[PDB]
Each structure stands twice: as structure tokens, then as C-alpha cells.
């Protein structure tokens, strides 16, 4: 749909949509920019991630409200409407996964880009897993695990322990362990090991990088406080 707009105009409009909190528009603009076929800059990757995280975040919150209402009920209307939102959520997840597969991941050679996209792939398989109930749930769960695991292997070899992408990846992989894989001890071990090695590396950072790293480090601490 965005094939006739300039790449630079799509990027500029994605930023305007963020300012207007029009995240659906922002996602459509960034999808158009990805489909131009060029690799994304660091800033452009963030725009892509922010756009779809907000879109799917609203769908997930709506799905949870309706699934709760549905659970207390057990007419077809609640199930029907929960299924409608669920299908729209899965469509957005498939769209993001399609962008990563065609062809963001295969062209991502640098550690910062490849880890970023593999983290995204794990995240959107995680969101698919939250609503899955059929014969494909285990395969969906393993697709999330495999994507997270490759990202972790690269991040451990190529990034410092305080790198915000490495920290955010570990945070979300620990949430995957706790919420999806029924492995709360793995979730707790990953979050604490990640936090402690970040602690020990903060002395190398500037004041601005220190602020970036400690902010995500606090999210790990919040989860450990909730889980222990």
C-alpha cells in the first residue's frame, strides 16, 4: 500500500505518527519502509519495533480482558469476539514475522542488527504462544525459544553485558521462561545472572550509557522481586 511513497517520507511520517500516538499508521509506514528492500538503521529499527509493540500491545491487553470474561462465563458472543481480536493479533504477528523473514534477518550481518531482529522474532512468536491452544502451540513455543537462543548466543559473544539490546533480550527471554515455558527457575537464573554481570560492567560506561543500562537493569530487578 505504501509502494508509491518515498522511503524517507515513510520514515518521516512514522515519526509524526509516533508523536500523534497513531501507532497503527506508524506500523504501516515502517512496513512500507522495510518493503523498500534496504537495510534499516539503528534508529529505523527502533521505529519499527516501537510501532508494532504498541499495536500488538493493545491487542494483547484487549485479548486478556475478553479471555477473562470468557473464562468466568464458562451465548457465543464473548467467544466470537475474543476470536476476532485473537485473529487480528495473529495477523499482526504474522506480518512482523514475515518482514523479519523477508528479508530483514538474512541481510543483518552486524551483531546489533541481527540480535535486534532475532529478539523481535522471539517476541512475536511469544505473543502467538500466549493465545495458542491447538496442535501447533509446542512448535510456536519452540520457534520463540530458538529465536531467543540464537540472539543470546550472538549477544554473549559480540556485545558487552551492559548493552541495552543484550539486556532487553535477556529480560524478554526470562519472561518467556516464566510465562510461556513454565520454567520459573530458568527465568530467575537468567535475570539474576544478567543483572549481576551488568552491575560489574557499569564502571566502563559514560553517564548516558550508564543511564540506558541501569534503566533496563531495573526491569530485571522488578521481575526478580515479583518472582522471589
Amino acid at each position: 500500500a505504501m509502494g508509491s511513497m518515498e522511503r524517507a517520507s515513510l520514515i518521516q511520517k512514522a515519526k509524526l505518527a509516533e508523536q500523534a500516538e497513531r501507532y497503527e499508521d506508524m506500523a504501516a509506514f515502517m512496513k512500507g519502509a522495510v518493503e523498500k528492500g534496504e537495510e534499516l538503521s539503528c534508529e529505523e529499527r527502533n521505529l519499527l519495533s516501537v510501532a508494532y509493540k504498541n499495536v500488538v500491545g493493545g491487542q494483547r491487553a484487549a485479548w486478556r480482558v475478553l479471555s477473562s470474561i470468557e473464562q468466568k462465563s464458562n451465548g457465543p458472543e464473548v467467544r466470537e469476539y475474543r476470536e476476532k481480536v485473537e485473529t487480528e493479533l495473529q495477523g499482526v504477528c504474522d506480518t512482523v514475522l514475515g518482514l523479519l523473514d523477508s528479508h530483514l534477518i538474512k541481510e543483518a550481518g552486524d551483531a546489533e542488527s541481527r540480535v535486534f531482529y532475532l529478539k523481535m522474532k522471539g517476541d512475536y512468536y511469544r505473543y502467538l504462544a500466549e493465545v495458542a491452544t491447538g496442535d501447533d502451540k509446542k512448535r510456536i513455543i519452540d520457534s520463540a525459544r530458538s529465536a531467543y537462543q540464537e540472539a543470546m548466543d550472538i549477544s554473549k559473544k559480540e556485545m558487552p553485558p551492559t548493552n541495552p539490546i543484550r539486556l532487553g533480550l535477556a529480560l524478554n527471554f526470562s519472561v518467556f521462561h516464566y510465562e510461556i515455558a513454565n520454567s520459573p527457575e530458568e527465568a530467575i537464573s537468567l535475570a539474576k545472572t544478567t543483572f549481576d554481570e551488568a552491575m560489574a560492567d557499569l564502571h566502563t560506561l559514560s553517564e548516558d550509557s550508564y543511564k540506558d543500562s541501569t534503566l533496563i537493569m531495573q526491569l530485571l530487578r522488578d521481575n526478580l522481586t515479583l518472582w522471589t
Binding site: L171, V175, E179, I216, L219, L226
Partner: peptide, 7 residues
């Protein structure tokens, strides 16, 4: 629910 990464 625990916290995942959020900008």
C-alpha cells in the same frame, strides 16, 4: 504479569 522491555 512481569515486565518485558518497554521504551
Amino acid at each position: 504479569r512481569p515486565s518485558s522491555w518497554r521504551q
